[PDB]
Design a protein around this ligand. Structure first.
Ligand code: NA
Ligand code: NA
Length: 331
DNA sequence: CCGACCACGCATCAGC
DNA sequence: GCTGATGCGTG
DNA sequence: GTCGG
């Protein structure tokens, strides 16, 4: 259960501001992740926070952020946040990572050499790798939400495309859209194939061959990166005659070995808390989960040798849990 | 006081 | 050339 | 930054 707008949003936003900043311009992924947990926890909390101490009571809140909340509540802002927002560097630095393939090193990099806008990006492409190029490109496309409907449409081709290449292949979208969402971030595509398994001899062809299918039939425009296991590229929808070209959407495909699909499948599908709580449970029954397997948790504290999973149900079954639908993998 | 915080593929980058 | 490490991005 | 050894 989650309410939250006129509730805590102010707080939750100054927070995320805070996070991004730490990431992007400070290079504190941990500190970044904190602020994130914090803001998230508060996002959930059914009340209107009246004090720092009040929030402190929360699991991620602590003194420093608690203090923040007091300055916010009282003043209606955060001095710190104002300078930063006013700060040239931090800003250009902030913005610049909005571009895919740019991180904080690059971003801080560019920015030093006086590069700091889109234009400078525009007028210096020589100084950008491919990944960074494709996203200088599709900047705007990149910050767009994907409408599961389009998504649906999306779902077809890939399903079909692969259907042709091989009948035995196994594709199944995942991520948010599996989670019945009404608007995704990108299409996530999970796939495998019979001839593809752990201890087996990995056939590059598999991923290879399929990206090409989707390539052949103009589904995938650009390419961010590729390897035997997973493809990170761009895709597009057949523009309907006299209907304006949709945007270009990020997509990723994932090739997995038969013996560890489902866990992977399982794992991928999330959600976040979903993973957190399940792993906890699977433990109680005496097991330890990850992205590839499940193993009988030792009689001595820790023990190996994974179990044979042939379905998400199979997994659920080991930990003695109801085959949860993806729809409700809320946690 | 002080380490942990998810693991992991691929691309580029430092080095040798 | 190859190796190993560091950037970036993903569910 | 927070939480925990
Ligand atoms: Na707390
Ligand atoms: Na970025």
């Amino acid at each position: 259960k989650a309410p939250q707008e006129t509730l805590n949003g102010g707080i939750t936003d100054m927070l995320t501001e805070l996070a991004n900043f730490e990431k992007n311009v400070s290079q504190a992924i941990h500190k970044y992740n904190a602020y994130r947990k914090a803001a998230s926890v508060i996002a959930k909390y059914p009340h209107k926070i009246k004090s720092g101490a009040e929030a402190k009571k929360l699991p991620g809140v602590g003194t420093k952020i608690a203090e923040k909340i007091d300055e916010f509540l009282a003043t209606g802002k955060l001095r710190k946040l104002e300078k930063i927002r006013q700060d040239d560097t931090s800003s250009s630095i902030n913005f610049l990572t909005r571009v895919s393939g740019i991180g904080p090193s690059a971003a801080r990099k560019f920015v030093d050499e006086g590069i700091k806008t889109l234009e400078d990006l525009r007028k210096n492409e020589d100084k950008l790798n491919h990944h960074q190029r494709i996203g200088l490109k599709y900047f705007g496309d990149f910050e767009k939400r994907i409408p599961r409907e389009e998504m649906l449409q999306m779902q077809d081709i890939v399903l079909n495309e692969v259907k042709k290449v091989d009948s035995e292949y196994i594709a199944t979208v995942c991520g948010s859209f599996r989670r019945g969402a009404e608007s995704s971030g990108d299409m996530d595509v999970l796939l495998t194939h019979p001839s593809f398994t752990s201890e087996s001899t990995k056939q590059p062809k598999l991923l290879h061959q399929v990206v090409e299918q989707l390539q052949k039939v103009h589904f995938i425009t650009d390419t961010l990166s590729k390897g035997e296991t997973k493809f990170m590229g761009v895709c597009q929808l057949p523009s309907k005659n006299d209907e304006k070209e949709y945007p270009h959407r990020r997509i990723d495909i994932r090739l997995i070995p038969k013996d560890q699909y489902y866990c992977g499948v399982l794992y991928f599908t999330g959600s976040d808390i979903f993973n957190k709580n399940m792993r906890a449970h699977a433990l109680e029954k005496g097991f330890t989960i990850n992205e590839y397997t499940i193993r009988p948790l030792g009689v001595t504290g820790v023990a190996g040798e994974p179990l044979p999973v042939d379905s998400e149900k199979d997994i659920f079954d080991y930990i003695q849990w109801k085959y949860r639908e993806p729809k409700d993998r809320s946690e």
